[PDB]
Structure 1
Amino acid sequence: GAMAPSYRVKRMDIAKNDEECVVNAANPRGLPGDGVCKAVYKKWPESFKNSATPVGTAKTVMCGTYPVIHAVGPNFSNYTESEGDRELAAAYREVAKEVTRLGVNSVAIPLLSTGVYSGGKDRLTQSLNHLFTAMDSTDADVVIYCRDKEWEKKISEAIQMRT
C-alpha cells in the first residue's frame, strides 16, 4: 500500500506515467483502437495478447513485469443512459479488484467513457464519481491522466473538495 494513499491529476500522455501499473481505456475486442488505447498499444503492444474482455470488465495482461489493466467502459452511442451508467460503474469496480490483486502501490487511470465512447456528452463528473466509488477503499496512490486544461482544473477541484 501507499504510506498516505492520495488522488492526483496530470495533463499528459498516460503512456508516459510514473506509476506501477496502467489502466487502458480498452475496446472489448483487444484491438489497437484510437486515443488512449492506441498510445497504450504503441507503448505496451505485448499486453494485447488475449486482452479481449466484455463491457463492464477489466482484464490484466503483463508487458514484461509491468501490468496493463484493460478496462472496457460502455460506448454511450449504443447503451441507454441507465444501462451505460451501470456498466461504467462496473468497469471501475473491476479495476479496483485488479489493482488490489496485483499489490501495486500506484496506478495511472484515464476517465473511462469520456472520449469517443461519450456519445457526444460531457461525462467528466459521472466518470470521475464512479472512479472514486471504486477506488476509495483501495490503498494505491491513484494518478488520473487527462488531455484538456479545463478538465485538469475541474478534476483537481473535485479531488481538493474532499480533502
Structure 2
Amino acid sequence: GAMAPSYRVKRMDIAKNDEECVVNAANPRGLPGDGVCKAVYKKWPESFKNSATPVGTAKTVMCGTYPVIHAVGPNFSNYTESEGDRELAAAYREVAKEVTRLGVNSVAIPLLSTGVYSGGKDRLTQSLNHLFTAMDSTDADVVIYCRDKEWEKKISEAIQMRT
C-alpha cells in the first residue's frame, strides 16, 4: 500500500505516467482504437495479446513486468443512460479488484467513457464519482490523467473538496 494513499490529477499523456501500472480506456475487442487506447497501444503493444473483454469488465495483460489493466467503459451512443451508468460503475469496480490483486502502490487512471464513448455529453462528474466509489477502499496512490485545462481544474477541485 501507499504510506498515505492519495488522489492526484495530471494534465498529460497517460503513456508517460510515473505509476506502477496503467488503466487503458479499452474497447471490448482489444483493438488499437483511438485517443488514450491508441497511446497505450503505441507504448505497450505487447499488452494487447488476448486483451478483449466485455463491457463493464477489466482484464490485465503484462507488458514485460508492467501491468496494463484494460477497462471497458460503455459507449453511451449504444447504451441507455441507466444501463450505461450501471456498466460504467461496474468497470471501475473491476479496476479496483485488479489494482488490489496486483499489489501495486500506485495506478495511472483515465476517466472512462468521457471521450468518444461519451455519446456527446460532459460526463466528468459521473465518471469521476464512479472512480471514487471503486477506488476509495484501495490503498494505492491514484493519479488521474486528463488532456483539457478546464477538466484539470474541475478534477483538482473535486479531489480537494473531500480533503
TM-score by length of 1: 1.00
Aligned-pair distance for 1:31?
0.1
Structure 2 CA distance for aligned equivalents of residues 128 and 50 of structure 1: 28
Give the structure 2 partner of residue 55 of structure 1: 55
- Give the CA deviation at 1:85: 0.1
The CA deviation at 1:83 is 0.1
Q: Supply the distance in 2 between the matched residues of 1:131 and 1:156 (Cα, whole angstroms).
A: 14
Q: Please list the CA deviations of residues 47-99 of structure 1 after superposition, one character each: whole Å capped at 9, or x if unmatched.
A: 00000000000000000000000000000000000000000000000000000
Q: Deviations over 1:87-142 (max 9, x none)?
A: 00000000000000000000000000000000000000000000000000000000
1:101 aligns with 2:64: no
3-state SS of paired residue (1:23) = strand
Residue 88 of structure 2: aligned partner = 88
CA-to-aligned-CA distance 1:9-59 (integer Å, 9 cap, x gap):
000000000000000000000000000000000000000000000000000
Quote the RMSD (CA, aligned, Å): 0.1
Name the SS for the 2:78 alignment partner.
coil
| TM superposition shift of 1:4 | 0.1
Separation in 2, partners of 1:98, 1:110: 15
Moved over 4 A (4+): none
Determine helix, strand or coil for the equivalent of 2:19: coil
Q: How does 1:6-155 map to 2 (within 5 A)?
A: 6-155=6-155
How many pairs align? Answer: 163
Name the TM-score, length of structure 2 as normaliser: 1.00
Query: Which residue number corresponds to residue 4 of structure 1?
Result: 4
For 1:118 and 1:125, how far apart are their aligned partners in 2?
12
Identity %: 100
Structure 1 CA distance, aligned partners of 2:140 and 2:87?
Answer: 23
In structure 1, list runs of 5 or more residues that go unmatched.
none
